[PDB]
Every structure is written in structure tokens, then in C-alpha cells.
Design an enzyme around this catalytic site. Structure first.
Site: not given
Ligand SMILES: CCOc1cc2c(cc1OC)CN(C=O)CC2
Ligand SMILES: [Mg+2]
Ligand SMILES: [Zn+2]
Ligand SMILES: CCOc1cc2c(cc1OC)CN(C=O)CC2
Ligand SMILES: [Mg+2]
Ligand SMILES: [Mg+2]
Ligand SMILES: [Zn+2]
Lengths: 320, 325
Positions: A72, A76, A230, A281
Site C-alpha cells: 500500500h 500501488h 492485480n 481470492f
Molecule cells: C496480488 C494482490 O493480492 C491481494 C491484494 C489485496 C488483498 C488480497 C490479495 O490476495 C489475497 C486484500 N486487500 C486488503 O485487505 C486488498 C489488497
Molecule cells: Mg484501501
Molecule cells: Zn488500494
């Protein structure tokens, strides 16, 4: 610096080499990408934004992303800005949004994680943090990102909106707040349900959205898609984002463990499956969201959805 | 002797129409402290929650200090009045044994903190003037978020943690309930809150004992939100000598805001222009469009418990109306 200029020629393309741009720009990807996008869209002339004021604000904003947070951070932010910029050009959304709505979506993307501490809202609540005390446990981070992003406009030569009318500034502020608050992951399911309803009632000639409620919902889902983009990027980029989020999550888990707290999901480095977590995810969050977006803008998002599905197949193949 | 008169007046704490302005003077401008202390003793809350008496007094005095003594309406007397009014509404026969001790504590604490550090100007004024508060809170329930943040932060001052002996689950549940209650005092939420209360009335379920059946968090918190909102909007339901003092105070606060708007070249907010005000028409309008629709619905929820309160409201509306022609 000629290398940096060549990379920025891809600013209209999904899969921009954002890490290369971060390196070539001396860790100023947010500033250079925002400046490029404002030029491509003629936003400085349209809104009478002095170029020196824009640069000064952008550098100040970028300085308030933390350099020691793995995910973050300003890279990003720059990636979400550029991704929103591409989605705003979806043919099915052609001339749907005014110049002020375009400015709001781009500005919201740039500030949407500013001053992020690298820990989740739940961590902030459970540790009785000052931020959670200020914001009454409700979209704690997202309220803070907005407050910082707007407060920085008051620094010397930082008011990029100085030549907007009073009415335009009030409208832009409301839209930016509505968009950034919608980036709180606890709102994902409600946003997706609303996007699904819009797809079911979709009126098309190209999308026709008559009321502000529907248009702001599209901008909310658009920036949310960009925030969750992403796994839809070329694999070389996606794998770097995975490494970064896992480092940030593991550091939160180390703090939780040192404090004797229950370690959050995906945050326990001694008990993690990076690849299973990515597949889950995608399956439960990213693909349902992007499949619905692709339906809204059909067929304009097909290449993005194709990449997401290829990347999901690849991560699954890394699981024995 | 002054302490004797104060104790006599505090014997009325269970009654609608308590002499709250007299209590404010007799207590040395500590109405919120003495009324909260009396209510906590009356409900046995110190024993139930193991609250040290010195901690309670220290917190209450610090909370009371954080109300502005120079604001005519949104001050410690208003807070004490809303606390005591909530305390009476919680005792209504239709709610007997409905709420837990923790829910009772949450409603009373929420009422005590619900306007703390109020600057005497509206959310819209704070938004339109680009105030630091509106910048912090993104224009959304600006005052009410601030009241909550201050009321909770003061618990961290020396010997102020009145919840020090609650369990962790109790503290978490209380914090969530207090936030939900205070955010519901934002007048921008009134129409949706009332619409939901009307739906509850139209579908209400009563137990064999005749009390309201509230079997999930959503219904329980909605009743507590509307209870505190009714207490906050209770001035026209009080005996007329109390109501007229509240009207004098809100008009002073409104007129001072309107003077700031006029000086800034802003459009003056409704009821805030001392050169074009009708105090009496404004009260009749307030009652007809806000206070009576709310109180008639609360009275339906607890029928017939609130009939005398509703009757006073209707008499006071008639009185103000009679001063117009
Ligand atoms: C390749 C990036 O993978 C992820 C990015 C993010 C999350 C989960 C991810 O994968 C499990 C959850 N978030 C906040 O809690 C946003 C960012
Ligand atoms: Mg945010
Ligand atoms: Zn963000
Ligand atoms: C006798 C008291 O009268 C009033 C009190 C209040 C309002 C309006 C009133 O009358 C028109 C509106 N409020 C905030 O803006 C809450 C307090
Ligand atoms: Mg004070
Ligand atoms: Mg209030
Ligand atoms: Zn109040």
C-alpha cells in the site's frame, strides 16, 4: 530519462510497466503517471490547473505514501490511477461520464490509500488505535485517506482545484468521498450486488445511465475493479504484487504475534499458502467482480478477463 | 442548605418534567454529573458493573467540562436533560425486562456524550465553511462522529475509565451500541429512522407479559436509537415553562450562527436570521413536521405508556399556535 518517456507511451494500455516506471522516475511513479494522464485527457487546460501546482500537489501526495510499506505505497496508487484511466476509456462507457466525473475518479484513485500504515481496519480496531478512535470503527482507513488527500490541497501552491467554481468543487468532493469510501473491502458484496442489478437492468443503445445513483455506483465499482486488478495484469506484474501483499500481511502477522493477538487470515508466515490464497481470492472476490464488470461493458473487458483466467490457471498449477 | 435543596430536586429524577435548570444552578453548573450519578445509583449500575465511584465522578466531571459553557443550547444542561429523559423512557412499562443491563448502560452513556464538544453551529455550517471537523469527517455526520470520538477518548484520561471492569466482550458490545445510538442523532437520518420505527409499530409483537418482543440486534438497537432520538427531540413535550426556556436557548444559538453566515456573505440557514425570524411559527412547524410525527409513533410503540407526554406536546403546540394570530 528517455527510457522513462518510452515506458509512459503505454499509459493507455493495460499492463503498463509500473515497477520500471517507479525505478526510472526516482520513486515518483504517482507523480509522473498522474501528470501524463492529466495531459492525455487535457485536464489541465479543461480545469485551468497550473502545471506547477499540479506537480507540487502530486509530489506532496506521493510523499505521504509510506516508503516502508510493501504493497500500500505510491506504486500501488500509481497502478490504481492508471488502471482507472484505462477503464474510463472502455468503449461501452463512451462519453458516459462528464469531465468532472473523470477528474473525480482519477483524483480519488490517486489519494485512495494515502498514508496507509500497512495494517488492516480490523487490526486498527482491535488494537484500539487512534485512527479507529477518531473514526468510530467505520471505514477507518478510507476516511483517513480522504482526509489526508483533501488536507494536502491546503499546502502552499497545492490547490489544484483553485479554478473550479464553488459548485464544481462541492460536486467533485462529494463524488471523491463516495468513491474512496467504496474501496473499503467490507463494502465489496453490497457494491457487487448493485453492479449485478445494473447489469440485469442494463439499457444500451453503449451504456445509458440516467441517474446520479447509477453513475456513482459505476464509478465506485470501476475504482474498486482497479484496486482489485492485480490478478488481471500480465503475470510478471501480478507475481510482484503477490510478493508485496504477502510481505505486508506477514509483517502485520508478526505484530499480531508479538502483541499476542490472533493472526489474521493470510498473515501467518509459519502457516501460509501463498498460492492457494491467490486462487481463493480470485475465485471468491476478483473473478465474480470482473465477470460482472465484463458483462456491463461487453465485450470491451474480454482481454482483461482472459488474462485473469490464464493467471488463475497458472497459480492453480503451482499447487502440488 | 443549598445541598439540601439539590437533593430534594434530585428526588424527581424518575419524572418527566424534572427541574433541570434549577438543578444546574443548585449543583454549581454540574447538572450532567449529578444527574448521571443519581441515575447510576438509582439503577444500581455502579454495583452491577463494578464502577468505582471516584472513577465515575472523575469521568463525568471531565465529560461535563468538554461541553461548551458559552453555547446557549448544546451544552451540559441539554446533555443532562437528554440523559434524564432517556432514563424515564427506559422505565416505560412496555419495555420492562426487555433490555439487558449492558444495553441500559449503553443508552444512558450514549445520551450523556451525544453532543459533547458541540461548537454551537450545524453540520451544514461546518461543511460550507470548510471547517477542520468537516475535513476530518468527510462531510458525513460531522458533529456526531466528533461527539463519539471525544466521549470515548475521555475514558483514557487519568482515573476516567468507568468501563475498566467490563469484560472484553462487554466493552466491544457497548462500544458498538453507543456508536450506533449517537450516529442516529444526526438529523439527516431522522426520516429514515422514523420510517423504520413506523414499520416496527405496524408489525410489532408483544410477549405474554405484554411487553415489546425484540429478538434480534437490529430491532433492539433500532428501539434504543429512536428512544435517544426522542429524548433529544423532547423539549416540546415538557411542561411549558421548561419548553420556553429551551426555545429561548435554541434561538440564541441559531441567531448567532446566522450572524456568522450573514457576515460571510452566505445564505442564512432556516430559522437563523434574527431580522426575519418567526420564533413561534418555527416551533409550530418543528412540532408538526418533526416532533409530533416522531412522538406519536413512539407513543404507538409503547401504547398507552406515553399518552400524557403526547398530550403535553399537543397542548404546547396549541399554545404556540395561539400566539401567532
Ligand atoms: C496480488 C494482490 O493480492 C491481494 C491484494 C489485496 C488483498 C488480497 C490479495 O490476495 C489475497 C486484500 N486487500 C486488503 O485487505 C486488498 C489488497
Ligand atoms: Mg484501501
Ligand atoms: Zn488500494
Ligand atoms: C425548543 C428547541 O427547538 C429546537 C431544537 C432543535 C432544533 C429545532 C428546534 O426548533 C425549531 C433543530 N436541531 C438542530 O439543528 C436540534 C435542536
Ligand atoms: Mg467546557
Ligand atoms: Mg447532536
Ligand atoms: Zn442533542
Amino acid at each position: 530519462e528517455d527510457v522513462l518517456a518510452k515506458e509512459l507511451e503505454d499509459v493507455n494500455k493495460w499492463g503498463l510497466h509500473v515497477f520500471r516506471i517507479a525505478e526510472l522516475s526516482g520513486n515518483r511513479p504517482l507523480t509522473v503517471i498522474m501528470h501524463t494522464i492529466f495531459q492525455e485527457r487535457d485536464l489541465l487546460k479543461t480545469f485551468k490547473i497550473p502545471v506547477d501546482t499540479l506537480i507540487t500537489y502530486l509530489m506532496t501526495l506521493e510523499d505521504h505514501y509510506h516508503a516502508d510499506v510493501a504493497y500500500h505505497n505510491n506504486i500501488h496508487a500509481a497502478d490504481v490511477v492508471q488502471s482507472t484511466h484505462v477503464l474510463l476509456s472502455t468503449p461501452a462507457l463512451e462519453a458516459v461520464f462528464t469531465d468532472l466525473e473523470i477528474l473525480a475518479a482519477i483524483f480519488a484513485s490517486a489519494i485512495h490509500d494515502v498514508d496507509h500504515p500497512g495494517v488492516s481496519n480490523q487490526f486498527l480496531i482491535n488494537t484500539n488505535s487512534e485512527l479507529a478512535l477518531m473514526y468510530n470503527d467505520s471505514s477507518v482507513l478510507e476516511n483517513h485517506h480522504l482526509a489526508v488527500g483533501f488536507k494536502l490541497l491546503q499546502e502552499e501552491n497545492c490547490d489544484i482545484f483553485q479554478n473550479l467554481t464553488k459548485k464544481q468543487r462541492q460536486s467533485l468532493r462529494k463524488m471523491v468521498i463516495d468513491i474512496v469510501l467504496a474501496t473499503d473491502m467490507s463494502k465489496h458484496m453490497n457494491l457487487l450486488a448493485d453492479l449485478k442489478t445494473m447489469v440485469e437492468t442494463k439499457k444500451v443503445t453503449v451504456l445509458l445511465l440516467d441517474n446520479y445513483s447509477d453513475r456513482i455506483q459505476v464509478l465506485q465499482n470501476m475504482v474498486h475493479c482497479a484496486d482489485l486488478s492485480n490478478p488481471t495484469k500480465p503475470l510478471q506484474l501480478y507475481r510482484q504484487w503477490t510478493d508485496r501483499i504477502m510481505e505486508e500481511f506477514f509483517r502485520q502477522g508478526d505484530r499480531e504475534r508479538e502483541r499476542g493477538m490472533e493472526i489474521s487470515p493470510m498473515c501467518d508466515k509459519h502457516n501460509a499458502s501463498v498460492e492457494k490464497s491467490q486462487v481463493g481470492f480470485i475465485d471468491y472476490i476478483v473473478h465474480p467482480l470482473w465477470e460482472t464488470w465484463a458483462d456491463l461493458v461487453h465485450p470491451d473487458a474480454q482481454d482483461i478477463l482472459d488474462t485473469l483466467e490464464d493467471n488463475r490457471e497458472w497459480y492453480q498449477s503451482t499447487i502440488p
